[PDB]
Amino acid sequence: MKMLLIHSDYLEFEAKEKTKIAEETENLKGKLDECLACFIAVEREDENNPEGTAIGAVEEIEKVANQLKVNNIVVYPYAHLSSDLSSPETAVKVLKDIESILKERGYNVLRAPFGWYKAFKISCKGHPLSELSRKIVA
Amino acid sequence: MKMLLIHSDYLEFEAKEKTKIAEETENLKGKLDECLACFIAVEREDENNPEGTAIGAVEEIEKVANQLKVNNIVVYPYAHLSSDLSSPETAVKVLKDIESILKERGYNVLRAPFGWYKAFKISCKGHPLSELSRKIVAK
Ligand SMILES: Nc1ncnc2c1ncn2[C@@H]1O[C@H](CO)[C@@H](NC(=O)[C@@H](N)CO)[C@H]1O
Ligand SMILES: Nc1ncnc2c1ncn2[C@@H]1O[C@H](CO)[C@@H](NC(=O)[C@@H](N)CO)[C@H]1O
Ligand SMILES: [Cl-]
Ligand SMILES: [Mg+2]
């Protein structure tokens, strides 16, 4: 799994174009202020252990989110972070689990929909811990 | 080299804090509209051929910019795209070369400062060619 975590003034997105793997969700458009935007590519190795991957990913997000005193999290599928992707069924499973576990831990989570081409706007705060890269190996 | 190309309504940045490897510059704030924002990690393999790498990079930028009818290009140093980075000296050499080559080919380029912490803002247009990853192996 590869993740880029961006401490943002806001993240706004709008689903524009369907792909063959687009999921119809209740958040085709969405916005979250004062948030950690987590851009996530689910990778082929993740298929070995989808559940452990989600757990590892949540541990890293919470480390960052707690250091920054941030409760708003956007889980944003971002397949461009890796050229070794998992299958779509595994990827959906892992993204929804990261969301589900974060909500159980009291975070305010907005999941952007899987399998769409989307427009987005972001403003990255630019302090020393505002942009962080994490590689998760379960 | 790893590149992530994003077709944007705009890209803005402001340098905030100097890292220990910051490039000396006066270009500390900048904005470019209707651009292809090119986030670039220069990798250690690029050390064997910095010239071919910049040429390889520009070739890929050109193919996208021509498809999308874009003339405005941001060259934005982005180490997080790769876990196997080049030296900072090689990275700047390559990024500068990318800019100068694009400039010779008629593109307008904004180059974001290397080794500074920057605030930034981007609006990605959201279509199938609006975000592209490219791996450049130099010829
Ligand atoms: N292994 C994977 N990890 C994360 N995301 C994945 C994926 N496989 C497919 N996707 C999703 O399908 C859209 C098209 O590839 C991807 N779309 C995107 O990454 C958008 N940023 C484009 O605007 C994403 O929703
Ligand atoms: N091989 C390389 N390729 C591209 N950029 C590189 C580099 N080595 C160092 N940098 C730059 O130094 C900052 C601190 O690592 C890097 N900073 C950044 O990538 C910010 N966007 C996130 O901190 C970047 O400016
Ligand atoms: Cl979804
Ligand atoms: Mg738009």
Residue numbers in the entry:
A (entry chain A): 5 to 142
B (entry chain D): 5 to 143
Anything the authors wrote about it?
To understand this intriguing mechanism of cognate substrate rejection in NTD, we have solved high-resolution crystal structures of ApNTD, as well as NTD from Methanococcus jannaschii (MjNTD) in complex with non-cognate and cognate substrate analogues L-seryl-3′-aminoadenosine (L-Ser3AA) and L-threonyl-3′-aminoadenosine (L-Thr3AA), respectively. The possible reason for this could be the remarkably low binding affinity for the ligand in MjNTD, as revealed by binding studies later in this section. L-Ser3AA tightly binds in the active-site pocket in such a way that a conserved hydrogen bond with the main-chain N atom of Lys121 (residue number corresponding to PabNTD) fixes the β-OH group of the substrate in all three NTDs. The carbonyl oxygen of the substrate has a water-mediated interaction with His83 in PabNTD, while the same atom interacts directly with the corresponding His77 in ApNTD and His84 in MjNTD. However, in ApNTD, it has only a water-mediated interaction with the corresponding Glu129, whereas in the case of MjNTD, this group is directly recognized by both Glu135 and His84. Moreover, the catalytic sites in PabNTD and MjNTD accommodate a single water molecule, which is the putative catalytic water Wat1.
Both share a striking structural and mechanistic similarity highlighting a common ancestry. While demonstrating that the tRNA provides the catalytic group, we show that the side chains within the recognition site are dispensable for the proofreading function, suggesting a primordial mode of protein- or peptide scaffold-based enzymatic activity evolved alongside that of RNA.
